[PDB]
Write an enzyme that holds these catalytic residues in place. Structure first.
Site, short mmCIF file in Angstrom:
data_model
loop_
_atom_site.label_atom_id
_atom_site.label_comp_id
_atom_site.label_asym_id
_atom_site.label_seq_id
_atom_site.Cartn_x
_atom_site.Cartn_y
_atom_site.Cartn_z
N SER A 21 0.87 -1.17 0.00
CA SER A 21 0.00 0.00 0.00
C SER A 21 0.89 1.21 0.00
O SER A 21 2.06 1.09 0.38
CB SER A 21 -0.83 0.02 1.29
OG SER A 21 -1.51 1.24 1.50
N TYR B 298 -1.36 -0.89 10.52
CA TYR B 298 -1.42 -1.11 9.08
C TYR B 298 -0.13 -0.64 8.42
O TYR B 298 0.46 -1.38 7.64
CB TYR B 298 -2.65 -0.42 8.49
CG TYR B 298 -2.88 -0.68 7.02
CD1 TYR B 298 -3.23 -1.94 6.57
CD2 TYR B 298 -2.84 0.35 6.09
CE1 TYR B 298 -3.54 -2.17 5.24
CE2 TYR B 298 -3.15 0.13 4.76
CZ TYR B 298 -3.49 -1.13 4.33
OH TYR B 298 -3.76 -1.34 3.00
#
Ligand SMILES: NC(=O)c1ccc[n+]([C@@H]2O[C@H](COP(=O)([O-])OP(=O)(O)OC[C@H]3O[C@@H](n4cnc5c(N)ncnc54)[C@H](OP(=O)(O)O)[C@@H]3O)[C@@H](O)[C@H]2O)c1
Ligand SMILES: NC(=O)c1ccc[n+]([C@@H]2O[C@H](COP(=O)([O-])OP(=O)(O)OC[C@H]3O[C@@H](n4cnc5c(N)ncnc54)[C@H](OP(=O)(O)O)[C@@H]3O)[C@@H](O)[C@H]2O)c1
Ligand SMILES: NC(=O)c1ccc[n+]([C@@H]2O[C@H](COP(=O)([O-])OP(=O)(O)OC[C@H]3O[C@@H](n4cnc5c(N)ncnc54)[C@H](OP(=O)(O)O)[C@@H]3O)[C@@H](O)[C@H]2O)c1
Ligand SMILES: NC(=O)c1ccc[n+]([C@@H]2O[C@H](COP(=O)([O-])OP(=O)(O)OC[C@H]3O[C@@H](n4cnc5c(N)ncnc54)[C@H](OP(=O)(O)O)[C@@H]3O)[C@@H](O)[C@H]2O)c1
Ligand SMILES: [Mg+2]
Ligand SMILES: [Mg+2]
Lengths: 261, 261, 261, 261, 5
Positions: free
Chosen positions: D143, D156
């Protein structure tokens, strides 16, 4: 519904008669782009143009990217025949490795002008046409020297880093204008330029050329030189409409020598 | 005075009469360095020199960093009083934001010459003295624009990125010569330059200056502008002998706007 | 740095009886911080605590950072004596290099838990006190392995990169709460553990220890190992109030091996 | 890309029934790869498998990537029909944003295990087969949170940054073994899940969905969300033999939000 | 159209 190629797109590639530039021109020709190829020596350029006419419409223009007047005339002539340039590949470069104190004004300016100044001027000439069409691709061939330092290559690193800065800023400025701006950063690639650099470093370090060639391949974790077609593969991928989200990026093609993030 | 860390070291700071350069000069003066302050206008320069004489020996030299002949004369004059320069801070910069198509040749060249060419030339003039002494510090004031793109600042980003490239390559070339080469990358900092840029952007975007100032502070996750003394704090830290392992680095001073790695 | 700068600040350093942690503790002690030192072996910890009492108030707590219950009790005891922790240095780490296919579940988890999980838990325990004081410093000792890859160190690189991710995200989340979160990334550092490893390899390969040391230092462009005090110098610099603008950064202390941007 | 490029290559895609994973599977199917698709819910998986059988041989395997026993059995069954896996795409992930102090042990571990631990385990299971064939591609879907911080996404960001570290170290370890290891880093992507979140916020704030979409897209300089097919296009490009020189890279697919170097 | 792509 299957044909999704670059047919009907005019691409201009600088430094396109040999090495990376020639491989980029070949990949773009096979994709269907109409090509304007620029290089200083006629002999190699004419052979390249003739070879690529088997795949697309191609025109060659003899010119030095560091000569603004010759480039303006060249670009004007090229767009009269094939229309506005949709894809620009700034590939022509300059490197002369030496100790920093041996870099006089002339040698500093040649590194800045060929690697960075030339790209700025050519983008300024061709950007209006891309803005008018609402679509474009600007691809700058930088180097791993645009991402990290190398001793004895201070002006080359400065110019190639400057080319990344130009890429990033222009990617943001043009983000909502239908144009992407990216840089491809090769490591040591098997070209005539690399062979000339091998002999220069061997002469400057009192080493056999074959031993310094092995050192060049040792910088690449894969233990081999990058092939010009691998650099070209990254370029043609960026020209697709599915690469529209790839913008302001530096793609290292060096086997892991530099790992971007 | 108790802080004697840099006592005796001759430090030359470019663009040192106001802003970040003046704060760098003040921090170096408080650490005991002997200072040569460079700026174009004599009036602000002489006032800064007189203020800093409360802490250390200081001299001012009038000069434009983009003028090679004036800089060579300046360096000869500066070394008369304080000897060879041990610490060089390249701080003088130039920015004029505008759309890329409005950047003519002269404006492109002014960004390259003030932010990059000037640092190359001054390092070339002072590096022999640092090599002779066996110790030195070269600190280049780049910007977050040397690390990422900004729309409407394409030449500034190109030049500031080029300064990072010069920093990295020279850090490696000088790694075993007792000299470190690093870059400090401020985000928006509360100076006369930023206030002038606020008014220019407000006039060019039909916005109130106060609204543009708030937008500039919103880029910093901390919700405020960086203070000149915070940039100066990073500079003085690099001059310690305990910062010898800090070499080829880009230190972002921007509250988290750019997070280097 | 002045010997009164961090007076009145309680700093807690994990893995502080030997190596980099011991050097960090010494630099903080010389700056006037009150210290809580954590390590598993009592004898080395007691000796370190006694040594640093020459400069400041110091206490030690025996504990394994990967034991949550022991760490909660330890932290409660430490804050009963010296009050809330203002500065947290997550220095305790774990590395065991091996081919990727030899990394079983438990060895993978030990790398993640000691280098990353432990930092998450300890920050979660001490962050409320920092938020209540309106000021704090969280400094994570990552590695050049948090910024680039190394073969045979896949779990170490994953955990140290994870620590950079935690650093960056938390720096943004706490940007307006008076707390900065940063990471220090040393390259190979000269510790007693490394010297023992150098001697073991020299004895096993019939080589002088100086020849083996040269292999270990080969990745450092400066031709030497990083000293623990150089890592410590970067840590103390971050604790100043003038380093408030340094947030979310990864500071490489590796002589130019990794050049951050 | 040619519809016969990856013919005869067994590709396994995790989290392949919906979103980015489904788009990656579709692009690999159109390139001629034989596919094993993995997801937890049978109905969505069966529908995806049936859809992709229009282009190639496809099989689905119900499984949770965080369940080691289920994954080992799944991998054995999958290789009985299509042989050793040549291309692995680690796409299954997990995110639950929250203020750092509200992240308990379980929530921290779920982020680390699904995004990082599961990729480690699946690579360890399939790497022997790739080494035996002398060719392979490991592609990790990280990401932009693997390259920069985001507030309220600390676990995350830690896990996705860890996945970049795993990528880099393994790319170096396998550099001369015929396998490349790369990461694709999407920014916010237009999936049915994101559209449901846009509509929920629009309904809760009495705004048109297009106004809420503009908030979600604000970080993307292009003013739009990334399309799943753009992420998939980068994945198929990496699988070519001409992308062998692309190793250890993080390819940001985010319109210029993160500009890698 | 004549040349395949
Ligand atoms: N090879 C490597 O290891 C390497 C590594 C990193 C990056 N790069 C970059 O890759 C790009 C191409 O390098 P290469 O290795 O392919 O070089 P090359 O083999 O020497 O080919 C360069 C091409 O550009 C032309 N050219 C040179 N100077 C020019 C100028 N001023 N104006 C117009 N055309 C010019 C040459 O033709 P004429 O001589 O007839 O003009 C030739 O066709 C450069 O930007 C270089 O910096 C290469
Ligand atoms: N927001 C920011 O302020 C910001 C952000 C990022 C980076 N920077 C960088 O920080 C550095 C300093 O900026 P600043 O904001 O402190 O600027 P400033 O407030 O305008 O001060 C600049 C100083 O440099 C001098 N100077 C300017 N051009 C010069 C030249 N050609 N030769 C010699 N001296 C010159 C000026 O005096 P004279 O006019 O008398 O010469 C003055 O003493 C620059 O490199 C800039 O790009 C600033
Ligand atoms: N040395 C290098 O070249 C290098 C390079 C890059 C990064 N680093 C990083 O620097 C940090 C410190 O490493 P170092 O090389 O200085 O290590 P070291 O010399 O082995 O010292 C480690 C210290 O931490 C303690 N410790 C070890 N494991 C612990 C645990 N589970 N809980 C609590 N205390 C523990 C040790 O004492 P006890 O054994 O008594 O507990 C000792 O005081 C680590 O995060 C490491 O990854 C080191
Ligand atoms: N604020 C929130 O609460 C929030 C927001 C976003 C996402 N999430 C969480 O994050 C997870 C991942 O989000 P996403 O963006 O990747 O969307 P997603 O649609 O849940 O997952 C993408 C694809 O991967 C599959 N998948 C998900 N987890 C898997 C696993 N552990 N093993 C195997 N396949 C798996 C999904 O199918 P299957 O679902 O059938 O397995 C789907 O095919 C979600 O499942 C959810 O639990 C929560
Ligand atoms: Mg890097
Ligand atoms: Mg970055």
């Amino acid at each position: 519904m299957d044909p999704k190629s670059l047919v009907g797109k005019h691409a201009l590639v600088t430094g396109a008669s040999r090495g990376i530039g020639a491989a980029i021109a070949e990949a773009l020709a096979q994709a269907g782009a109409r090509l304007t190829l620029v290089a200083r020596k006629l002999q190699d350029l004419e052979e390249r143009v003739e070879r690529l006419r088997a795949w697309t419409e191609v025109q060659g223009e003899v010119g030095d990217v560091a000569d603004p007047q010759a480039m303006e005339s060249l670009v004007h002539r090229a767009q009269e025949r094939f229309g506005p340039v949709a894809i620009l590949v700034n590939n022509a470069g300059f490197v002369l490795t030496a100790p920093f104190l041996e870099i006089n004004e002339e040698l500093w300016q040649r590194h800045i002008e060929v690697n960075l100044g030339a790209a700025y001027r050519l983008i300024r000439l061709l950007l209006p046409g891309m803005l008018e069409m609402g679509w474009g691709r600007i691809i700058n061939i930088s180097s791993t020297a645009g991402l990290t330092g190398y001793p004895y290559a201070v002006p080359y690193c400065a110019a190639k880093h400057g080319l990344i800065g130009l890429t990033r800023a222009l990617a943001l400025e043009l983000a909502q204008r239908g144009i992407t701006v990216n840089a491809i950063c090769p490591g040591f690639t098997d070209t005539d330029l690399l062979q000339a650099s091998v002999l220069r470093v061997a002469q400057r370090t009192a080493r056999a050329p074959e031993a310094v060639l092995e050192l060049f391949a040792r910088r690449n974790p894969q233990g081999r030189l990058v092939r010009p077609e691998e650099v070209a593969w990254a370029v043609v991928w960026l020209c697709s409409e599915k690469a529209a989200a790839i913008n302001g990026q530096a793609i290292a093609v060096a086997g892991g020598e530099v790992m971007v993030g």
